[PDB]
Design a protein around this ligand. Sequence first.
Ligand SMILES: C[C@H]1c2c[nH]c3cccc(c23)S[C@H]1C(=O)O
Ligand SMILES: C[C@H]1c2c[nH]c3cccc(c23)S[C@H]1C(=O)O
Lengths: 328, 325
Amino acid sequence: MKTIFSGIQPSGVITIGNYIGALRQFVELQHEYNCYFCIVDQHAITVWQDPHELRQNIRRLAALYLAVGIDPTQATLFIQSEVPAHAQAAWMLQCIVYIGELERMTQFKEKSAGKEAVSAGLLTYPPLMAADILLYNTDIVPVGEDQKQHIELTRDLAERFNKRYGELFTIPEARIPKVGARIMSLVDPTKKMSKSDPNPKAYITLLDDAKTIEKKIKSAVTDSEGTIRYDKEAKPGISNLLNIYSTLSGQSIEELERQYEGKGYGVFKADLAQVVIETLRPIQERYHHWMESEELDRVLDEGAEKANRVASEMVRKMEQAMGLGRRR
Amino acid sequence: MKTIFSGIQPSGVITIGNYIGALRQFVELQHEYNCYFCIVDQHAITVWQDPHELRQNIRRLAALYLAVGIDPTQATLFIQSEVPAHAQAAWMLQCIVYIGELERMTQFKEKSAGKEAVSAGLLTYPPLMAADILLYNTDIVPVGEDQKQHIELTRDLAERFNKRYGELFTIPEARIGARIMSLVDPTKKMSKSDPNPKAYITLLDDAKTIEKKIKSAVTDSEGTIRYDKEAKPGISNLLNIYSTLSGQSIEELERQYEGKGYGVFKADLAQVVIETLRPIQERYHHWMESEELDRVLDEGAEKANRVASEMVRKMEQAMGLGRRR
Ligand SMILES: C[C@H]1c2c[nH]c3cccc(c23)S[C@H]1C(=O)O
Ligand SMILES: C[C@H]1c2c[nH]c3cccc(c23)S[C@H]1C(=O)O
């Protein structure tokens, strides 16, 4: 069995595009793979964070992952800062990465934009991410092309350590098993839907209430043709809505096209709004149950204990290879 | 009860200059102050360390501090890597420090000077040093003048953190016991990391080594035993070592060796060093052969961990990490 590690940024609340692209399939994948889901609060403070908002977003994210079907007895769900091994191994990895390798990172050259003076944490983001992955002998990281450079560095650091001290790390690969449709912004169908869009009409989050879902689908961009047909280059907006509808309803695009022959966009959108609301309502109900239950803290307590068991053993092996500490 | 924190670098040695300059006094101050003595193995690996030699030198330094007289029922002696809070707090402080502050550190520029392949840890270790200090609400840090820039940054990071989040850190101060110079280049301080082993006498040098290093200590060719830092830095430094170890003033040593040569003066000084180190080395071997050494280090980590994990809990609460409520 292969191991999967997903780091989850707390600040952002899940969009349907994330759910459809890379999260929903994990409800079943968690039984075929050994899955780690890690809320990276330590990565979150590499930029400016309001403390109360960060704490609430950490909890909300855990409750959301449980609400969608992540099973804490099949997968390991935990908060990064509650496993000290991540900080310990990130320091050891800082000691084998070259400064030049960090300065070259594209994400660091961005994010450094209209800031002038930036935190050292933004430069050492990648070693901590490599540590997150490598501590669990991860085989697969479910990320897209925007994280390619970070995965390359992770693979470089694993190989450098293995060749300097002896084989210890698995060399991870970037891959989203059973990847879903790539869902685009409702406002700009050529841009991917993302939780950081400055236009809130661009995304629907898993926590949007019905009125908001209705208004956002209502304003979603289409075209002037009035024909429900998949054509990504000439009808990117309609094509995107067909991808959301198809995956959330279980009907193929061809069947939706046949279904809507002769119909305009008004009735197709009102049907899509209902499909989304019906998808999120159960998730939102279980979510509210988790957020008001003591079982959420107990679940996260054991997630961190089970993660620490694996990661603290890897730290012991790294320290032993590098000369740290004693063996007594 | 003021708190003292001292880092002990296992990549280097413990020289007679450190013993003279600070370490000898700790045997006294450990009853006045709350003293933490930290073997900073995570700082050592910013450059390649031979693993077996690093592991062994960690034990050697712990045994050596005990042999010199550090009292584990009075002070805390522990290994940095055995307290995870140092790495955790270093990360949080890395998020507070600016890259520009780390890059203009003089120690970074010197240590990276001729080096191909510079690790990020060589740039980003001042935050881990700040963490070593701030975690224990340290009042006093006993460091050379070479470290003054690192103490300034630590003071800046503590204030920056205190202003944003609330008064959590003590603002520490550098202590900075004569200043012993290198035996090979007496215009430089004797240094725990000098790459020339003849530059220093370590606390573990045996009699024959001590005699050799003193014999070849560099000196002028004029030949009068007299203190003159500008013209005669070599013999002046040897006079200062001799004075502080024997209890005699430099003037009394000058009168004592009037009309005598360097050979006889060097042989007397070598004996003075040997007689200083011999009891230290005898207790060193008993500690190295003792099960008790590992028990002292276990307790030290327990006590260090209690204070540091508590401070990390407070830092996490301030910044919003975790669930600390
Ligand atoms: C969440 C971030 C990161 C934290 N450590 C890990 C481990 C695996 C995947 C990722 C991450 S994905 C990456 C990102 O910026 O998207
Ligand atoms: C040992 C080094 C360092 C590690 N963290 C600390 C904490 C206190 C004092 C020092 C240190 S002194 C410094 C040096 O290089 O001299």
